[PDB]
Amino acid sequence: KIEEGKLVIWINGDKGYNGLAEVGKKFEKDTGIKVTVEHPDKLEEKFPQVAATGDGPDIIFWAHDRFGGYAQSGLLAEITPDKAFQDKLYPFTWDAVRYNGKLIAYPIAVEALSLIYNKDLLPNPPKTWEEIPALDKELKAKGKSALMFNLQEPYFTWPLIAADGGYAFKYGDIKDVGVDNAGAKAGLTFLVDLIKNKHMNADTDYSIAEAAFNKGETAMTINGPWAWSNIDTSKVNYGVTVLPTFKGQPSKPFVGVLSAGINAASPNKELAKEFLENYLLTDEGLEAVNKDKPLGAVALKSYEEELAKDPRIAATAENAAKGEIMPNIPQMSAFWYAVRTAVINAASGRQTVDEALKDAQTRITK
Numbered sequence: 001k002i003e004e005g006k007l008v009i010w011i012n013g014d015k016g017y018n019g020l021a022e023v024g025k026k027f028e029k030d031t032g033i034k035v036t037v038e039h040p041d042k043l044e045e046k047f048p049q050v051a052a053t054g055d056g057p058d059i060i061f062w063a064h065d066r067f068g069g070y071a072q073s074g075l076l077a078e079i080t081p082d083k084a085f086q087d088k089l090y091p092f093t094w095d096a097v098r099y100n101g102k103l104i105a106y107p108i109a110v111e112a113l114s115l116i117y118n119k120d121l122l123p124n125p126p127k128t129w130e131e132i133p134a135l136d137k138e139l140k141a142k143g144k145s146a147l148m149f150n151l152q153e154p155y156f157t158w159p160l161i162a163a164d165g166g167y168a169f170k171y172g173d174i175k176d177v178g179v180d181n182a183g184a185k186a187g188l189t190f191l192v193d194l195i196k197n198k199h200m201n202a203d204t205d206y207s208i209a210e211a212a213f214n215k216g217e218t219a220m221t222i223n224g225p226w227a228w229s230n231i232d233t234s235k236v237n238y239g240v241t242v243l244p245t246f247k248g249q250p251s252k253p254f255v256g257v258l259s260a261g262i263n264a265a266s267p268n269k270e271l272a273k274e275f276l277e278n279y280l281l282t283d284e285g286l287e288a289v290n291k292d293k294p295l296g297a298v299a300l301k302s303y304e305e306e307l308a309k310d311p312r313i314a315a316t317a318e319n320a321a322k323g324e325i326m327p328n329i330p331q332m333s334a335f336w337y338a339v340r341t342a343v344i345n346a347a348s349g350r351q352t353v354d355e356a357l358k359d360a361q362t363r364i365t366k
Contacts, residue, residue, distance in 0.1 A: 001054045004267045006034045007275060010047065011061035013039040015258075019292030020061075023285045027275050035275065051075040051263055058266040059276065064096045064105065064257040068328035071099040077262040077269055078102045085277060093299035095171070096257040096325045105259035106276050108286075109295035112320035113159060113224050113253040114312070115244060119237045121219040129160060129190065129246040136199045139219055146199065148213060149222035150206040151347065154339040156222060159253040159323075161187035161343075163246035168254075168327050168335055179339060180354075180361035187246060189353045192346050202347040225296045225316060240312040243319050250322040257325070258295065331364070338363040 002008070009024070011017050017039045024035030038057070040046055044066055050056035052073065060070075070076045080103070086094065093107035117125045121144060126132055136146035150156040158166075165183020170176035178184060194200045213221040214234040222243070231238050243251035260280070262272045279285050283303045289295060290307070297317040298304045308314040327335055341363075342356035351359070 002056065002058060002263065002266050002268070006036065007059065007268060007271055008057040009035065009037045009059045009061070010043050010057040011037065011039055012043060013041075014293070015039075015061065016289035016292030016295070019289040020280070022288045022292075023280055024275075026285075026288075027279050030279075031271075031274075033271060048073065048075060051265060054265040056263050056265070058263050058268050058272050060261045060263065061108070061258060062261070063326075064107070064259040065326045065328055065332060067097065067105050067259055067261055068099050068332075069330040070261060071102075071104045072330060075264050076104045077264045077266065078104060079106060079262060079273065081106070081273075081277060088281070088301060089299040090301060090304070090321070092255075092321055092325070093257055096255065096328065097259055099328065101172075105261040106281065107257045107299040108260055108281075109258040110297040110299055110317060110320045111224060111256040111258070112297075112316055112323050113156065113222050113243070114240045114315045114319050115220060115242065116213065116223055116227075116231070117220045117239050117241065118213070118216060118218075119239050121216070125220065125239070125241055126244050129163070129244045129251075132244065133194060133197060133199050135219075144216075145212070145218040147220045147222075148200070148204055148209045148218040150204065150209050151195075151200070151202060152205045152340075152344070154336060154343055155254060157188075157191060157343050158339070159222070159243055159251035160191055160246055162252040162324060163187055164249050166252065167324060169329060169331065174329055174331055175365065177335075177361060177364050179335075179342075179364060180357040184357055185353050188343065188346055188357060190246065191343070192353060195347050225294070225312070228312065240315040242315055251319070253319055253323045254326045255320045255323040257299070334364045334366075 017037050021037040027035050044062050047060050097103055097105040097107055132146055139146050161184050164186055165181055166187055167178035195202045209221055212218045216236055260276055262269055281300055286298055286303050297313050338360035342360040345351040346353050346356040
């Protein structure tokens with residue numbers, strides 16, 4: 001099964017696995033324990049198959065949303081950091097790793113959508129959604145549009161739909177979803193109106209929105225940190241800020257937390273805890289991973305205050321703190337399917353905000 005006296009770590013190849021490997025050697029030279037870092041493909045799929053037979057890595061890195069399912073099968077060890085350490089990280093990053101009331105992973109990085117704007121076309125971006133319809137009319141007078149973002153994926157529209165009262169699964173509880181409540185309806189209605197008044201096209205997807213923004217056709221777009229590299233090479237003078245409010249309340253973008261779990265079958269749990277708590281989750285450890293490939297916003301308060309010197313990271317973290325934690329539970333799949341259909345049928349008059357959303361509520365509660 002899992003070897004004793006060492007650490008095998010799994011993380012995705014699109015991360016700073018080389019940087020994490022450096023943090024490992026730093027551990028080796030300090031204990032004599034070899035830390036092997038691997039980045040298998042479909043690792044999010046291989047874990048539940050190797051761990052089930054008592055095998056696999058000691059530590060697995062991945063987005064928090066898949067961890068609920070791992071802990072459901074008892075593949076994850078309940079971690080136990082003391083109050084002192086828990087305080088070194090942002091409180092909300094911890095709610096992302098709580099399952100059935102217990103902590104099942106350490107939060108590493110934070111991710112969330114932000115409002116991106118062309119500083120040349122829009123010196124002062126709108127603080128609210130309600131002021132966007134008007135703004136678009138002004139920009140139309142010059143041949144430019146106000147906003148353009150992916151409308152096909154609920155992941156991009158959820159921020160608005162949930163701004164006022166809207167929410168996925170109630171914190172923990174699965175029989176309590178806020179998809180067809182008054183808030184979600186108000187938000188989706190405002191979204192559909194923008195499409196009806198021609199302020200936005202119902203066929204706008206990711207590629208179209210990105211092209212429009214980079215070619216300088218539209219003033220704003222909603223995207224994540226993974227999109228910045230594209231805009232940089234576009235030269236366009238852009239900025240990243242907090243998302244607009246809707247009816248006085250903040251937009252609720254889903255939050256993704258890159259988490260580090262400990263294999264339940266691992267005989268090196270104490271070592272894993274040592275590595276993660278005193279070697280990785282430190283300003284030096286994270287700065288070694290971030291240098292390889294940026295993590296975005298981090299859960300470690302001390303280091304995050306250092307990364308926030310970037311606008312873009314600071315905006316990411318602000319939007320996240322106000323966001324909603326992606327459904328950690330396994331019932332997540334239904335939600336995405338249900339909401340996606342609703343927004344689409346709602347946008348193309350196939351159904352009304354009431355019908356669409358109501359059908360989505362049942363589909364998820366079943």
